[PDB]
Amino acid sequence: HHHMLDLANRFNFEGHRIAWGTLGEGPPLVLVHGTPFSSQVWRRIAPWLARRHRVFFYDLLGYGQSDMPDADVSLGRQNVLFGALLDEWKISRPRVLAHDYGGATVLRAHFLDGIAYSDLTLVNPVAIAPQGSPFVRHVAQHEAAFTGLPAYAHHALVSAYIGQAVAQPLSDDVLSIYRAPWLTPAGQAAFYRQIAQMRQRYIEDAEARYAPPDFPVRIVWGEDDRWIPLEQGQALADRIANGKLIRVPRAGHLVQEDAPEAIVAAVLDR
Amino acid sequence: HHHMLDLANRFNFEGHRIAWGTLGEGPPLVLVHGTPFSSQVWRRIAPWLARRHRVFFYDLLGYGQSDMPDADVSLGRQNVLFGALLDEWKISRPRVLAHDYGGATVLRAHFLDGIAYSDLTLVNPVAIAPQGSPFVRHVAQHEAAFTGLPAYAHHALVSAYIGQAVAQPLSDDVLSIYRAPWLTPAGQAAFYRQIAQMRQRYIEDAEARYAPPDFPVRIVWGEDDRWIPLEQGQALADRIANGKLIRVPRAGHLVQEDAPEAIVAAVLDR
Amino acid sequence: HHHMLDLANRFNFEGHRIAWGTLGEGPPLVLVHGTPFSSQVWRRIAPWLARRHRVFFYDLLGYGQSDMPDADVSLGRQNVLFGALLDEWKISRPRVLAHDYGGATVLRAHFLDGIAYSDLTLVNPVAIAPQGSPFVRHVAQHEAAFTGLPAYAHHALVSAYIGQAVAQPLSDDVLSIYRAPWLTPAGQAAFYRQIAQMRQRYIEDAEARYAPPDFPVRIVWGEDDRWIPLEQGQALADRIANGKLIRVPRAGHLVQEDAPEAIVAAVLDR
Amino acid sequence: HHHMLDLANRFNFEGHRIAWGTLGEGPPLVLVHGTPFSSQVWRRIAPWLARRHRVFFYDLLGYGQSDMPDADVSLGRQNVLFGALLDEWKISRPRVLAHDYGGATVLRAHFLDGIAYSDLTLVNPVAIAPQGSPFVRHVAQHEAAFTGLPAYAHHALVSAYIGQAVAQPLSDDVLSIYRAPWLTPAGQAAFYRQIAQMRQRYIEDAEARYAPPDFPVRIVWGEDDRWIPLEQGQALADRIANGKLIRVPRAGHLVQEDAPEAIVAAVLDR
Numbered sequence A, B, C, D: 001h002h003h004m005l006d007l008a009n010r011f012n013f014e015g016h017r018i019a020w021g022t023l024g025e026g027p028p029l030v031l032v033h034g035t036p037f038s039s040q041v042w043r044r045i046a047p048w049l050a051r052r053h054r055v056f057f058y059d060l061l062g063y064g065q066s067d068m069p070d071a072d073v074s075l076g077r078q079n080v081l082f083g084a085l086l087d088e089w090k091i092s093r094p095r096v097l098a099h100d101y102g103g104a105t106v107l108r109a110h111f112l113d114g115i116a117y118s119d120l121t122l123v124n125p126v127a128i129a130p131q132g133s134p135f136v137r138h139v140a141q142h143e144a145a146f147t148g149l150p151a152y153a154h155h156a157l158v159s160a161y162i163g164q165a166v167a168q169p170l171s172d173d174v175l176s177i178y179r180a181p182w183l184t185p186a187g188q189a190a191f192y193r194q195i196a197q198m199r200q201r202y203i204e205d206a207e208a209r210y211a212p213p214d215f216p217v218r219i220v221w222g223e224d225d226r227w228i229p230l231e232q233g234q235a236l237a238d239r240i241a242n243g244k245l246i247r248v249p250r251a252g253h254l255v256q257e258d259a260p261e262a263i264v265a266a267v268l269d270r
């Protein structure tokens, strides 16, 4: 596979270590991943965006190379960390590129917390409620029953769940990039924890304020998304992007794997 | 793959349909499968045994093509069904070939119910208490939590669980033979039902009476079985087979897939 | 996989039908593939370039969906066809995006035939002599022996040869896209024919004239190319691009499959 | 996969080392493989035949672990070696189990050289003229073009050719067992060498003498054999086996991989 992004740095967020890294120089561009993934979703994207921007990426608290504490790692926490990183990085009016729960996080940070962006690219965002597959919804009710699974059975569930996000099946090498953080004893608990902490109110609170903002918004949408119906993406575009949707054929929820070129084009050909 | 066995007959067992079939002519030989499989474990074995025997095979109540009722399908039921079928078939002193819970069933039918056999070939039988893999032991405590899973997640767990039974991974075609009965709504509930009903007492009651029986016994034992430790196979051989164990290297629990030739040899090369 | 590009049009070139298609509106951009592939190498690239350009793509004579005649299909012919299509399409100073033998063809058309471009993006071009893989050099000496192979053996060789062009193995569905044109009786003969017609002089004639052209030029280079050494890519960049290569890590010859996002970035982030 | 047979011994055949091994004790049983394979075709069969026989197996000159000389390795040589081994092993009237060119060899040794057997089991033997797949016939006419292939192309050809012998595709681990001897520089030359040395006369000379022998003959025939038409198997059965075939459904030429249990049953169930 293509190389993993180097998240060399550690930011202390309220006693938790947050992994982050940067590439390139120029105007700031911040990349925000979703669940159950990590900044590695940008490994074929960030290097091309870094030719003309200083690109920032970090792993959400509870994900990837960041700490996975027995603590609040929900969307109620992630926009606080997002704002804290922008201040740590001393950046103003960043370009923002965000996927899934990362999209929820930057929509909360703008509409609830007032953070100004220079422009915003969303990729299959979780943005209007209710949201959540039946698996997420069922697992959230039996957390201890799933965290206690034998390692191989957990391995199989994580592998299948990640597989639902793509229209083209991943190679095992690539699937491993996203699965591996969840396979340690801490990671297995962390996987079901962030599912169990999901709550509709985090998205509903942001959605109540949606309106076209004072910066351009574009929404890249994998048409074959098994998790969110296409018409929900169009409804979001109607609400904040003047009805504009960048539809990506033969791509599922994880457009970064099915069609990273689509995201590169959307950001660079703006 | 090889042809599936035709189980074209239906026997009424206390109001439940039991699928069964036969091949060949000659002395009777009855094949008994275990969990979570079906008579299809004999599809590469029964045709060769049928050259000189009238071979009978049936699907346990709750498995395969037999009915999957919300009722007792435990080992406490299966020996009753086994004896009822021997009566229905009007067979006396069959040769017996049995695997896993099929082995427990024919051991109970002989040592508890007094049924005489011509000879007995066991393949990785569940015969010594306690028995239960980590997945079965864990899932037994969370039945509704697992039956409630979305189809693709249950699909993932069943595929992985079946995979633990073999040393050489199955092709998808062959895995599908064993997985498919558990994927309908009734099959999904039935899969977790037969796990929830497992009890050590069904094995313990037979084990308390173990001794060399009044017919030849041999035990074919896949050495790499992930579900039953070799020590219990050695114990069974010491208790009922005068220390004789046919160890099969590089074969897991499901010897019928890793090394069906070993079972054909054990039965035919007396 | 992603949709195949629709090449619904046919151009009559000296009695041979040439397949081609177009997407988008605006300034013209022409895409030129290489061997042994087709315009399908642009199926994840052309749609994004078509957002702001009218994209044209065609299959080289002897390739893809174009006719596969028992005639000259070498690079000596392809620049004549390229110029004929530009005239047919009535396009002036197109942007050009070209790979492998497509690069050789557009370099010949500019440096030998004087055709003007407004911009040139080359991807792992065949441009510096000598060029040719071990398979090509061997098979060029035994055309009849390989054409005479039974279908499944030719199938295996074409599959293996195509696989040498990528760093990440293709799915069988994607490999089929590129292999299928070569599997008919006519396609099997055409595959070895275009190998046997290769000659270094077609490259050498163009190379003698290389200098920085009067339009911008950039070279995308998959670093792990098994068919062209990096040093020849650098030599070309030294001659026509002021020493600049856009290096693509973990990408082989067929950057379109290993890293299509790199090509999209190189064209659009100009 | 199941472990490889240990051919621990070496026999001097006319200045060439021949690999051979034995398992078990009791009456002799000699196993003879065919092309392009080795004694490893018996790795799941020989251990079960050894429970009551002393089983002998060796690799044909030119194959497997035996020497691969630039010398005659054809069927014209192999019956000489077979007779020399029987004499070296001091065995008389052995049971014989032979496949493919191994069948041709033991048929030639009996009907042309007069060696008496006590029992003969043939598996998809080469025995009736003419015999030879289009791949074999074409490669035999262009030997130098194929031996000079790049290693990866030879690897793909050998893999595909072996794949034609099975109805169920091999795992790569198992395919490796059969492919590996042909991948060294010496093995690559040796692979095309034994194809190029094939001649119909070796079969025709034996076929002219076929008649029911003074020992039992059984013919195991994989019904899906792509290399030898079923009609030639029935023709052989009519001439030396009283018209009897042991048909094996859903098995190809290499019955040892598709259905080793069928060969075990055929030898032992008597």
Ligand SMILES: [Cl-]
Pocket (backbone or CB within 6 Å): A012, A013, A014, A015
């Ligand atoms: Cl902090």
Ligand SMILES: [Cl-]
Pocket (backbone or CB within 6 Å): A198, A199, A200, A201
């Ligand atoms: Cl909620």
Ligand SMILES: [Cl-]
Pocket (backbone or CB within 6 Å): B198, B199, B200, B201
């Ligand atoms: Cl219990």
Ligand SMILES: [Cl-]
Pocket (backbone or CB within 6 Å): C001, C002, C003, C044, C174
């Ligand atoms: Cl694709």
Ligand SMILES: [Cl-]
Pocket (backbone or CB within 6 Å): C012, C013, C014, C015
């Ligand atoms: Cl013309």
Ligand SMILES: [Cl-]
Pocket (backbone or CB within 6 Å): C198, C199, C200, C201
């Ligand atoms: Cl030349």
Ligand SMILES: [Cl-]
Pocket (backbone or CB within 6 Å): D175, D176, D177, D179, D180, D183
């Ligand atoms: Cl190998």
Ligand SMILES: [Cl-]
Pocket (backbone or CB within 6 Å): D198, D199, D200, D201
């Ligand atoms: Cl000949």
Ligand SMILES: [Mg+2]
Pocket (backbone or CB within 6 Å): B133, B134, B135, B136, B161, B164
């Ligand atoms: Mg288990």
Ligand SMILES: [Mg+2]
Pocket (backbone or CB within 6 Å): B234, B245
């Ligand atoms: Mg022992």
